[PDB]
């Protein structure tokens, strides 16, 4: 009935860890940088932002408003509200090394 899986469940594990990390309140943002350096450290030294920025726009269905209304929300609006504000904070922090087409799709959301 009320079990909800985490909406980042289906992503490449590194992204899952990043988004898990940002969840943890206002010191959530800082942690993200430690996560990115702690994946520069591991076997996959580059981090494939283009895939996370695709996956952040992908849509799934939700039922909000009255009781019944089918709507399509991208990921960025569906994951927890402190993760949103600390994601966009960490993109503000690392803008230069991001592909613009993806970034723009996110801002479009």
């Amino acid at each position: 009935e009320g079990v909800e899986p985490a909406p980042w469940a289906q992503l490449e594990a590194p992204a899952r860890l990043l988004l898990q990390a940002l969840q943890a309140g206002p010191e959530g943002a800082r942690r993200g940088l430690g996560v990115l350096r702690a994946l520069g450290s591991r076997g996959w030294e580059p981090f494939d932002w283009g895939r996370l920025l695709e996956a952040l726009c992908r849509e799934e269905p939700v039922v909000q408003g009255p009781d019944g209304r089918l709507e399509l929300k991208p990921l960025l609006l569906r994951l927890p509200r402190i993760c949103q504000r600390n994601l966009m904070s960490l993109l503000m922090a690392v803008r230069p090394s991001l592909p613009e087409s993806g970034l723009l799709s996110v801002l479009q959301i």
């Binding site: 985490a6 942690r31 702690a38 039922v63 019944g68 592909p99």
Partner: protein, 370 residues
């Protein structure tokens, strides 16, 4: 139209009502140039609270997962027309997600043109191609003799729309695509962007050679930061600007409060002596008025012994004690950070004073005893 007399014809043309009393529809339903079988049954009256809806196995595998939504929509939707509008939308979404399994390119243009174009580039270039032929990756060289890769991802219609270009280097790469352009065009733009950033590269190459770079270990080509170690148990981290590498960097100090302070003072005094005509090292050495060690310890670097959740040593008296049972991770944690993490995950299960869960970094069984 508004009423379900011409609107239903116009919005689901391949649904044919079998019965005179329009109660059983059968036929096809359209989505992204693909028709799916569908057969619907109403009661004696026009209520969808109870109705049959059968589909082909094509359609069920694609409406896998959304089964509960559709089931819900059957009960919640007022009219049949709106239920079909919603199910076509929904179907579009389920297809756009698993776009991997569902596609077909137009060969006569595609496969031949791409192979002609890779011949126009030169087969010295190509290094990788995906079985779906969607992703390909090419190589180029610097005049300095550095390899830089470029990933493209191609659509069903390659020459029509832009292909998504992914590249490592830290300034944003801009590729003027035309419908007339091809792989040679974007590749020439890529070589131009490479030759632009040469100077930044020279800087980082000289640094990674003549100094103990520490924590971008085996650094990427995107990386602007270089935590340099100096003396012992103190470091200076250094971020460099790509447009102006030779220009003064952002630098500050981690380590012992008593050792760093005189260094900050000496820096303050010498910062006017910075000169962007020499090298970064040749400027820093006379600015901070000290020399570096050339790899004082190569074996026992500062293996990060911090929580790997909170990234601190000394969390509330506690030490990084709880560790990973893994040779490849070996990552310490804290009781508190690792308890609040494991109590979150859905996989974890708690015995009396024990929680078993996955190590955050490597996702291996880790045990925590409170």
């Amino acid at each position: 139209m508004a009423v379900t007399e011409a609107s239903l014809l116009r919005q689901c043309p391949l649904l044919l009502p079998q019965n005179r009393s329009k109660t059983v529809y059968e036929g096809f339903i359209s989505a992204q140039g693909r028709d799916f079988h569908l057969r619907i049954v109403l009661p004696e009256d026009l209520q969808l609270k109870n109705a049959r809806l059968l589909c082909s196995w094509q359609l069920r595998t694609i409406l896998s997962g959304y089964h509960r939504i559709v089931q819900q929509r059957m009960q919640h939707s007022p009219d049949l027309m709106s239920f079909m509008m919603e199910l076509k939308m929904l179907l579009e979404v389920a297809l756009k997600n698993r776009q991997e399994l569902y596609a077909l390119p137009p060969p006569p243009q595609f496969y031949s043109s791409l192979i002609e174009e890779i011949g126009t580039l030169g087969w010295d270039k190509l290094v990788y191609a995906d079985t779906c032929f969607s992703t390909i990756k090419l190589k180029a060289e610097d005049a300095s003799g550095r390899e830089h890769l470029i990933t493209l991802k191609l659509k069903a219609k390659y020459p029509a729309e832009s292909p998504d270009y992914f590249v490592d280097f830290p300034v944003p790469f801009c590729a003027s695509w035309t419908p007339q352009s091809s792989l040679i065009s974007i590749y020439s733009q890529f070589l131009a962007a490479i030759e632009s950033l040469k100077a930044f590269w020279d800087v980082m190459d000289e640094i990674d050679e003549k100094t103990w770079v520490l924590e971008p270990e085996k650094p990427p080509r995107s990386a602007t930061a270089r935590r340099i170690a100096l003396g012992n148990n103190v470091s200076i981290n250094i971020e460099v600007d790509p447009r102006h590498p030779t220009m003064l960097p952002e630098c500050f100090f981690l380590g012992a409060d008593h050792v760093v302070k005189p260094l900050g003072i000496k820096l303050s005094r010498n910062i006017h002596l910075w000169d962007p005509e020499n090298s970064v090292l040749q400027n820093l050495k006379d600015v901070l008025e000290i020399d570096f060690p050339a790899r004082a310890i190569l074996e026992k670097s500062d293996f990060t012994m911090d929580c790997g959740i909170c990234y601190a040593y000394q969390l509330d008296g506690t030490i990084p004690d709880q560790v990973c049972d893994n040779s490849q991770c070996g990552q310490p944690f804290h009781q508190i950070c690792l308890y609040e993490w494991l109590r979150g995950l859905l996989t974890s299960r708690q015995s009396f004073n024990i929680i078993f869960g996955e190590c955050p970094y490597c996702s291996k069984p880790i045990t925590l005893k409170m």
